[PDB]
Each structure stands twice: as structure tokens, then as C-alpha cells.
Design a protein around this ligand. Sequence first.
Ligand SMILES: [K+]
Ligand SMILES: [Mg+2]
Ligand code: NA
Ligand code: NA
Ligand code: NA
Ligand code: NA
Ligand code: NA
Ligand code: NA
Ligand code: NA
Ligand code: NA
Ligand code: NA
Ligand code: NA
Length: 76
Amino acid sequence: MQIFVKTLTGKTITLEVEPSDTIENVKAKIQDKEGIPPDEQRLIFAGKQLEDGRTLSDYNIQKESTLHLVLRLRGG
Ligand SMILES: [K+]
Ligand SMILES: [Mg+2]
Ligand code: NA
Ligand code: NA
Ligand code: NA
Ligand code: NA
Ligand code: NA
Ligand code: NA
Ligand code: NA
Ligand code: NA
Ligand code: NA
Ligand code: NA
């Protein structure tokens, strides 16, 4: 199924996902498209920060849901 991820600057990222995917799998898909390491990604649905080990099903994230991506870089 398709979900959408909106970036801070308002670009859309379309993903193909399954309800059974973990948030970590979603971040891996975002890394495939945008090159962002997962540790530096935060995903938000309906105001909730999504935990990497939980599933899309855990959050009732259905087809055509929009998630918001926020980046938090490592210190260096
Ligand atoms: K939507
Ligand atoms: Mg750093
Ligand atoms: Na779609
Ligand atoms: Na499921
Ligand atoms: Na990846
Ligand atoms: Na990819
Ligand atoms: Na809620
Ligand atoms: Na977790
Ligand atoms: Na995980
Ligand atoms: Na779970
Ligand atoms: Na659809
Ligand atoms: Na739609």
C-alpha cells in the first residue's frame, strides 16, 4: 500500500509499505530515497512520534496516511 511522507520544506515522498512494516523499515525506505541515516530520522503521525520497533498496524496507519519527517542530526 501507499503512504506519503512530508518533509519539513513540504516535499512529498511516496512509499510502498505493508501494515506489518516496522517504523525502522519505513526509515530504511526513506534512506533508500533520501540518503538520510535512520538514526537521524523522526517520524510523526497525528502528532505522535513513532517508535522504530513498532509497526504501521500498531499506529492504525492505513493506506494513504501522511507521516511527517523531521531530521535530528548527530553531534560532530
Ligand atoms: K494523507
Ligand atoms: Mg555529529
Ligand atoms: Na497513494
Ligand atoms: Na498487520
Ligand atoms: Na536503506
Ligand atoms: Na532505495
Ligand atoms: Na492520538
Ligand atoms: Na522502538
Ligand atoms: Na527497530
Ligand atoms: Na508490534
Ligand atoms: Na491507495
Ligand atoms: Na487518496
